[PDB]
Structure 1
Amino acid sequence: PSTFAYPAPLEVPKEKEKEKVSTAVLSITAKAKKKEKEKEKKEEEKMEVDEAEKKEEKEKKKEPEPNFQLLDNPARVMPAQLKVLSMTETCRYQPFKPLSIGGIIILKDTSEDIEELVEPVAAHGPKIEEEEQEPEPPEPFEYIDD
Structure 2
Amino acid sequence: EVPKEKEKEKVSTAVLSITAKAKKKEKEKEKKEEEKMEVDEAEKKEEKEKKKEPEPNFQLLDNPARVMPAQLKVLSMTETCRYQPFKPLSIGGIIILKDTSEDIEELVEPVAAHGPKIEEEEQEPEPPEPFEYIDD
TM-score range, shorter chain: 0.3 to 0.5
Change in 2 beyond 3 A, CA 1:66/1:133 = closer
CA–CA distance in 2 between the matches of 1:66 and 1:42? Answer: 59
Q: How far apart are 1:18 and its partner, in Å?
A: 2.1
Change in 2 beyond 3 A, CA 1:100/1:145 = same
CA–CA distance in 2 between the matches of 1:132 and 1:57? Answer: 61
With structure 2 as the length reference, what TM-score do the two structures score?
A: 0.45
Cα deviations across residues 95-134 of structure 1 (Å, max 9, x unaligned)?
1566544616343413212455468631123122479999
Contact 1:41 1:48 in 2 (8 A): no
Contact 1:42 1:48 in 2 (8 A): no
Contact 1:114 1:125 in 2 (8 A): no
Task: Report the more deviating stretch, 73-82 or 110-119.
Answer: 73-82
User: Which consecutive unaligned segments of at least 5 residues does structure 1 have?
Assistant: 1-10
Change in 2 beyond 3 A, CA 1:39/1:87 = farther
Contact 1:33 1:57 in 2 (8 A): no
Change in 2 beyond 3 A, CA 1:13/1:130 = same
CA–CA distance in 2 between the matches of 1:69 and 1:24? Answer: 40
With structure 1 as the length reference, what TM-score do the two structures score?
A: 0.43
CA–CA distance in 2 between the matches of 1:83 and 1:71? Answer: 25
Contact 1:103 1:117 in 2 (8 A): yes
Contact 1:104 1:116 in 2 (8 A): yes
User: Which consecutive unaligned segments of at least 5 residues does structure 2 have?
Assistant: none
Give the aligned CA root-mean-square deviation in angstroms: 8.3
Task: Report the more deviating stretch, 78-87 or 42-51.
Answer: 42-51
Instruction: Say which structure, 1 or 2, has more relative contact order (CA 8 Å, 6+ apart).
Output: 1
